[PDB]
Design an enzyme around this catalytic site. Structure first.
Site, PDB file in Angstrom:
ATOM      1  N   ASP A 252       0.777  -0.993   0.093  1.00 44.96           N
ATOM      2  CA  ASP A 252       0.071   0.220   0.562  1.00 44.96           C
ATOM      3  C   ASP A 252       1.021   0.924  -0.221  1.00 44.96           C
ATOM      4  OD1 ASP A 252      -2.805   2.337   0.405  1.00 44.96           O
ATOM      5  OD2 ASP A 252      -3.334  -0.464   0.365  1.00 44.96           O
TER       6      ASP A 252
ATOM      7  N   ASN B  32      -2.610  12.979  -3.426  1.00 46.73           N
ATOM      8  CA  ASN B  32      -3.011  12.867  -4.689  1.00 46.73           C
ATOM      9  C   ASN B  32      -4.100  14.130  -4.937  1.00 46.73           C
ATOM     10  OD1 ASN B  32      -3.046  11.824  -7.582  1.00 46.73           O
ATOM     11  ND2 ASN B  32      -4.949  10.339  -7.346  1.00 46.73           N
TER      12      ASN B  32
ATOM     13  N   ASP C  33       0.963  10.115 -10.263  1.00 48.82           N
ATOM     14  CA  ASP C  33       1.674   9.003 -11.112  1.00 48.82           C
ATOM     15  C   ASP C  33       2.856   8.941 -11.414  1.00 48.82           C
ATOM     16  OD1 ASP C  33      -0.992   9.357 -12.068  1.00 48.82           O
ATOM     17  OD2 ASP C  33      -0.500   9.962 -13.926  1.00 48.82           O
TER      18      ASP C  33
ATOM     19  N   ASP D  39      -3.958   3.146  -4.943  1.00 53.25           N
ATOM     20  CA  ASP D  39      -3.165   3.031  -4.750  1.00 53.25           C
ATOM     21  C   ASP D  39      -2.379   1.530  -3.784  1.00 53.25           C
ATOM     22  OD1 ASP D  39      -5.105   2.079  -2.387  1.00 53.25           O
ATOM     23  OD2 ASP D  39      -3.968   3.477  -0.727  1.00 53.25           O
TER      24      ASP D  39
END
EC number: 2.7.7.65
Length: 165
Positions: free
Chosen positions: A37, A45, A54, A80
């Protein structure tokens, strides 16, 4: 050459797993899973944009590939989350892999669009295949190990261990 296109799609997980479990059951060789994770990915984000996310995913994916073999499998499992299937890696070899990956991501230096240091870490749940016919069980217990890693504060690896009870 975008490392992200190398990632396997989760739709292949059951087929691949059922094949590797079948193989592990006949030869008695180890099989193990990492569920990985990216910590605070959702937070990062929308605090720095989808382009930043990204780039994190690229840096993180590169870490996986630099630490596994052509015999292993690297999946994009969710937004994620990643799943790595290791074949013929002992418990210790599996833990060492997870730690090499974890340390590598922690030490990775990344700046946002505006030049601020974005701290990166991973939570990792590891589990060994123990003969159970269902691949879903192997993923479940690695997921239990990963939930433990998150609740203990993230940036760590946990190995699923059967209760002594």
């Amino acid at each position: 050459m975008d490392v992200l296109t190398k990632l396997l799609n989760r739709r292949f997980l059951p087929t691949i797993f059922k094949r590797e479990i079948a193989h592990a059951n006949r030869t008695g060789t180890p099989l193990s899973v990492l569920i990985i994770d990216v910590d605070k990915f959702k937070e990062i984000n929308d605090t720095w944009g989808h382009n930043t996310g990204d780039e994190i995913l690229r840096k993180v994916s590169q870490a996986f590939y630099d630490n596994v073999r052509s015999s292993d499998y690297v999946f994009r499992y969710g937004g994620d989350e990643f799943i790595i299937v290791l074949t013929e890696a002992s418990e210790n070899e599996t833990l060492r892999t997870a730690e090499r990956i974890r340390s590598r991501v922690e030490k990775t230096k990344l700046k946002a669009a505006n030049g601020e240091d974005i701290a990166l870490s991973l939570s990792i749940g590891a589990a060994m295949f123990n003969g159970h016919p269902d691949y879903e069980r192997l993923i479940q217990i690695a997921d239990e190990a990963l939930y433990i890693a998150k609740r203990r504060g993230r940036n760590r690896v946990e190995l699923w261990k059967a209760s002594l009870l």
